[PDB]
């Protein structure tokens, strides 16, 4: 994974990308298509482009570069935000508190029971299934961090 | 993963949690500690809590319940946000465009190349290492979505 400073470096350079996203998007697709020409074959609108000059002149290639880097930027920012809250919790629960995954299963059972008890009108079979899935994603994400840290859990 | 309706059900019941986070947190921890007493042994600062009555009377058990459910709520919301960034991209790139992970590796290397070319002063070795790791997490997260959608990328 990334450290806190590494995530901040990713966010910082993406700010520079966004200040000329058209130029960055063009240069990324030109590098991809010149380095790996087979990738051009996926693009009906671009597969005729041979030279860097032709690729630079394509309004459609420039538009697509912006779409790609916008989508990737959103994924990186949301990943960084999730990591910033998940990482410290996995770190403390692995290294200081030493909490096995089975204990996270026990507290997940308690959360599901309490929500069902308190809010049956907002916690029918489907909503309970949804929360069961959400807490399993949470436990699996902690377990993945545990494996990286070498903690058996 | 969860459907959009399933995430809505999770966030709807979490709104009820947030209306009394301390009460929900207390009830979750007392359910956990009464059902699985070995879990209470992990809390050195609750060594004075033996009985259900003592647990209900504890200021700090209730405060800890708030800490736990506040942290969990934040992680669930940030997970949902990142899932929502990945979903449309994994959908189209698995089912319509059929983009192999090797091609995602090629475009990741193109992004690193363009950032090194454009920002050598602000994309040194460490910042490049950070972005290399972030793009690998992106590819791995898409590969996991590919497997869920039944696409061999
Ligand atoms: C960082 C990696 C990538 C990102 C963020 C990305 C993002 C996007 C986005 C947002 C779209 C438009 C909406 C959609 O169809 O999902 C798109 C379309 C597309 N992508 Fe990607 N993509 C990436 C990598 C690739 C690669 C490596 C290829 C092929 C080698 C590829 C091929 C396509 C194709 C063929 C389309 C449809 C183009 C069109 O009909 O206009 N993508 N991509
Ligand atoms: C939904 C699951 C959980 C969440 C969100 C959670 C969250 C937290 C948070 C935010 C803290 C304070 C900051 C920190 O040290 O990381 C904490 C502390 C702690 N957690 Fe957890 N926790 C969870 C499950 C558990 C379980 C199941 C146990 C034990 C069986 C446990 C044992 C502890 C202990 C011993 C501390 C230190 C308490 C203190 O002395 O103040 N956690 N937890
Ligand atoms: O793309
Ligand atoms: O906790």
Residues 6 or more apart whose CB falls under 8 angstroms from that of A31 comprise B110, B113, B114
Could B28 and A78 be called an inter-chain contact, meaning their C-beta atoms sit closer than 8 Å? no
Task: Assess whether B115 and B60 both reside in one domain.
Answer: no
Q: Tell me, yes or no, whether A7 and A77 share the same domain.
A: yes
B81 and B105 fall within a common domain: no
Q: Do A4 and A78 fall within a single domain?
A: yes
Pocket of ligand 2 (CB under 6 A): A 89, 92-93, 97, 99, 103-104, 107; B 39, 42-43, 45, 67-68, 71-72
CA distance A49 to A40: 8
Q: How many domains does chain B have?
A: 2
- Tokens describing residue A91: 């770190």
Mutation target among A67, A79, A129 for the B interface, most CBs of B within 10 A: A79
At what resolution in Å was this solved?
A: 1.2
Longest pairwise C-alpha distance within chain B? 66
Q: How far is CA B48 from CA A97, B27, B53, in A?
A: 18, 18, 12
* Experimentally determined by: X-ray
Which is it for the CA torsion B75, B78, B80, B82, positive or negative?
A: negative
**How far, in Å, CA of B130 to CA of A28, rounded?**
18
Give the C-alpha distances (Å, rounded to integers) separating A80 from A94, B102, B132, B149. Answer: 21, 24, 14, 24
Work out whether the CA dihedral A22, B145, B130, A88 comes out positive or negative: positive
Question: Which residues contact residue A8 at a Cβ distance below 8 angstroms, ignoring those fewer than 6 apart?
Answer: none
CA distance B12 to A74: 24
What does the alpha-carbon distance between residue B66 and residue B72 come to, in Å, rounded to a whole number? 10
Q: For residues B71 and A142, is the Cβ–Cβ distance under 8 A? A: no
Residue B82 and residue B105 in one domain: no
The range of the structural domain enclosing residue A4 comes to: 1-96
Same domain for B114 and B67:
no
Mutate which: B28, B86, B105, vs A, most A CBs within 10 A = B28
Burial of A14 (0-12, 13-18, 19+ CB in 10 A): buried
């Amino acid at each position: 994974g990334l450290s806190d400073g590494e995530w901040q470096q990713v966010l910082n350079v993406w700010g520079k990308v966004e200040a000329d996203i058209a130029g960055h998007g063009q240069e990324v697709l030109i590098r991809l298509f010149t380095g790996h020409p087979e990738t051009l074959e996926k693009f009906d609108k671009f597969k005729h482009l041979k030279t860097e000059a032709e690729m630079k002149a394509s309004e459609d290639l420039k538009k697509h570069g912006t779409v790609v880097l916008t989508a990737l930027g959103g994924i990186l920012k949301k990943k960084a935000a999730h990591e910033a809250e998940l990482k410290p919790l996995a770190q403390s629960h692995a290294t200081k508190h030493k909490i096995p995954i089975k204990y996270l299963e026990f507290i997940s059972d308690a959360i599901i029971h309490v929500l069902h008890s308190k809010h049956p009108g907002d916690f029918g079979a489907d909503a309970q299934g949804a929360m069961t899935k959400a807490l399993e994603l949470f436990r699996n994400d902690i377990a993945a961090k545990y494996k990286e840290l070498g903690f058996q859990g």
